[model samples]
Target chain A: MLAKVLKKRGAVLRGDFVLSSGRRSSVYIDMRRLLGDESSYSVALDLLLEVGGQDLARSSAVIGVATGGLPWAAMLALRLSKPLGYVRPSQVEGDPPKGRVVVVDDVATTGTSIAKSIEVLRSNGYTVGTALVLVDRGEGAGELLARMGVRLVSVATLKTILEKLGW
Target chain B: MLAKVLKKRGAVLRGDFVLSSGRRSSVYIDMRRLLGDESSYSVALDLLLEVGGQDLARSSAVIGVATGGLPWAAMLALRLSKPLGYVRPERKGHGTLSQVEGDPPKGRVVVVDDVATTGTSIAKSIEVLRSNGYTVGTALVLVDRGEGAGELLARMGVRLVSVATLKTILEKLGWGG
Candidate 1:
């Protein structure tokens, strides 16, 4: 249902583009468009919770990667009734990180964003153990996070998205 | 509902605060704490929607200022099921180098934030939205610190709507004389 909704909304696009991961891809899924929609946004959070399972409940808070992941994590934070914070690529002043938290993002391509968020959170004294994403582009994010002891939970993989579209 | 929650959460602060408007105050309201709470967050949105009235329905999108206002705007955007965008304090990189992110502002737009103190961010948001052709005349916040923000916004042609005033919140908690 959501796949069709995403497709109808043009969340999935075909083009030559360079992602934050620095890897090239012929297809790009613009998660910003999907999360901006009501139904699509709900489904994205629902799927995130579903895939997140029990670890979500154990997390004391939800931290979002700045920019795109902020909305997704905010809604999820609201849904979970947990504290919410975000990590920015650029440094800013604020309270330090606290307790075990789950990280959220709309899409994870090379996992650089997630990893960077982990580094910032860890360096700031946050115990981050899990990262959740709406879609994983089948890049090296899974392996990349594994090395850091952070579990990557993805609701939909790019492969699954393509398969659902009958590609 | 919001006042009690804000007090219980200790969102109110005492001591000297140099507000963004460059005024000194003996009290401050940290609205971000209230927004971070689930129940308070919902009540805030409810109150905001009620205060927004027809202007919200007529709005094509809701735009929030960066950082603090982003979460409130995002949740409100999802609640209203309307398109959402934000105004950044600084521009980043090329590609039009636009400060407004997400959907472009068009038609009636309402700016939102957690608190209104100096009204600086609210004014900046209105200016950015107006320069981009968005018809903005109203702003909604959880609390109004009552330190001339209402007057400042009114001077800028934007009505400031708040769920509670600093005096009201303090009075409810027995902190205001």
Candidate 2:
């Protein structure tokens, strides 16, 4: 029902779109568009909790990769009563402790940003092992993170979204 | 001390810049540059609270405008014993209360954003006022909303910043400053 509602109101349609993973598609998924609506956010948050559950909050803190991942991270933190911080893509004056952070993003394709986030987290003395994303494009980012001994979780995958959306 | 630190470690350059408000200038202020450094944020948030004090969060909830304002608003809200929410710039759904929610809408709180271009963002978010049915006793921005609400909120050059918001950002916009 939530997916059906999202399809009608939130998803975007375009002739050509380039995803964060450098893949080209005819569709653009502007998840932030859903954020502008409160009911959409409420429904999405409920879906996330159904997927992530209590474990989402049990993590020491919620770390979001800046800019893109901030909205979802903020929502989760607010719902779960967790403290929140984000990993900066660039090195800053005091960045050591940000490494062991559990991070999130809107979607993961190649997981380049997530991996870069891991590097930043590691540099900050954070042992980033667990991560969550909205969609996984099956580009082997989970495998990459696994090779690095990290746990990457996703509420929906490209295959799943495609199936649900009937794309 | 913080100014000197910013001068040395922050985004200091000797070149022309264009601000978000489309104003041309000789310098740019990238508060985003401070996100990675704890000391920078520490000094900044410390000064922020030191100045705004209880008045900033004397209400029910802290409301952060989406995107940029969340960080500062979240930090202050955490300290203030208040819940938090964000007022998006536009309404995007069928519901009557289609907008406003990161925290609770009914709670009294401060509304904030990173920088205000022309008071457009804050004014558009006035739905918070309509939804809660209460005037925002105070509306804040890291930079002023402009259009001349107060002299302290005035900009000197092309920079989008104002002494008013800076006073609030540095935590000095209270009775003392």
Candidate 3:
């Protein structure tokens, strides 16, 4: 349902692009499409909570990787009644991070954005045990986060979305 | 209650500082204290909703002003199930300058911000939204610095409401409210 909604909204951009992961792509996954709309936000919120499951109970906070993930994590933080913070690639804007957190993002390609955020949080006395994304490109995010003793959760991967669309 | 929560969280810092408005003050207000904690965030949200009241009902969408206001606006938008959008003042030129991001601003929208220092940021957003054909009139802020923000917005034919006031927080601490 959400996959069709996202595609209709043109969340999948077809063009020449270079992601933060330093990889070129013909398609760019933009989660803001769902983040900005009421219907999309509501549905995605339900799906994220369902996937959150047992991991949420132990999470002290739901952190968003700045810019894109802010809305996603904010809704989750409100729903879970957990604290919310965000990590910026350029600068630290929120309060100091501490305790266990579930980092969220729009899409994890090379996992560089989420990985860098994990590094920042960990260095700032925060325990990042689990990370999640709206779309996992299935690049190296899983393997990358695995080395850091963190679990990478994906609501939906690119392959599954493509299969659903039969494209 | 929020005043007590904010003060206890060290939201009001004591010292000489120059605000973004280029004005100096003996204390600085850090809204992140309320935003970055679970207990504080929950209480703040409830308080915001209670205050949102009639504005929430009349609003067709909720838009946040970049950076600090994004989280507050996001929660409000999600809770109200209103379309969410934001305007970034950092990257802009000419008229409105294509800084509005996320959902397109249209219909009757309520603008939100973390703090209304001089109501300048909120005013700019109202102009941007209005220019984009959004029927902008209502505005909400987490805290008002008591610097004529209400009068300024009222002058623009906008009704602005704040959850808390800096004067209230200061007066509670026995300072000049």
Q: Give me the TM-scores of chain B across the candidates.
A: 0.86, 0.68, 0.89
Candidate 2 lDDT tens digits, A64-167: 76656776775666556555567555542222233345677877777877888777666656676787887677877898888887888887776776678877
Given candidate 3, what's the lDDT at residue A131?
87
Alpha-carbon RMSD to native, per candidate = 4.0, 9.0, 2.8
Highest DockQ model number: 3
lDDT per residue as tens, model 1, A3-93: 8867866778898988766777789887876644566667777788899989887887788887788878877877787777777854311
Backbone atom clashes (below 3 Å) for every candidate: 0, 15, 0
- List candidate 1 segments past 4 Å from native: A13-16, A24-28, A89-99, A119-126, A162-167, B1-4, B15-29, B57-60, B80-83, B92-95, B104-107, B127-134, B147-157, B167-177
In candidate 1, position B142 carries an lDDT of 80
Q: Report the C-alpha lDDT of model 2 over B36-59, residue by residue, as the tens digit.
A: 444554555565565555556466
What are the runs in model 3 whose C-alpha is more than 4 Å off? A90-97, B90-100
DockQ of each: 0.37, 0.11, 0.53
Candidate 2 chain A TM is 0.83
Instruction: Assess each prediction's global lDDT (C-alpha) against the native.
Output: 0.78, 0.58, 0.79
Q: Judged by lDDT relative to the true structure, which candidate is superior, 1 or 3?
A: 3
User: What TM-score would each prediction reach against the true structure?
Assistant: 0.78, 0.56, 0.88
For residues B4-98, write the lDDT of model 3, one tens digit per residue. Answer: 88877778877889987788888889886676777777777777778878777667788888767888889888777788888767654645455
Q: Write the per-residue lDDT of candidate 3 for residues A1-167, one digit (tens) a residue.
A: 66887886677777899866677877777777675677787888887877778786578778888777888888888888777888876433456346887888878888778888888888778888788887898878999999988889888998888778775
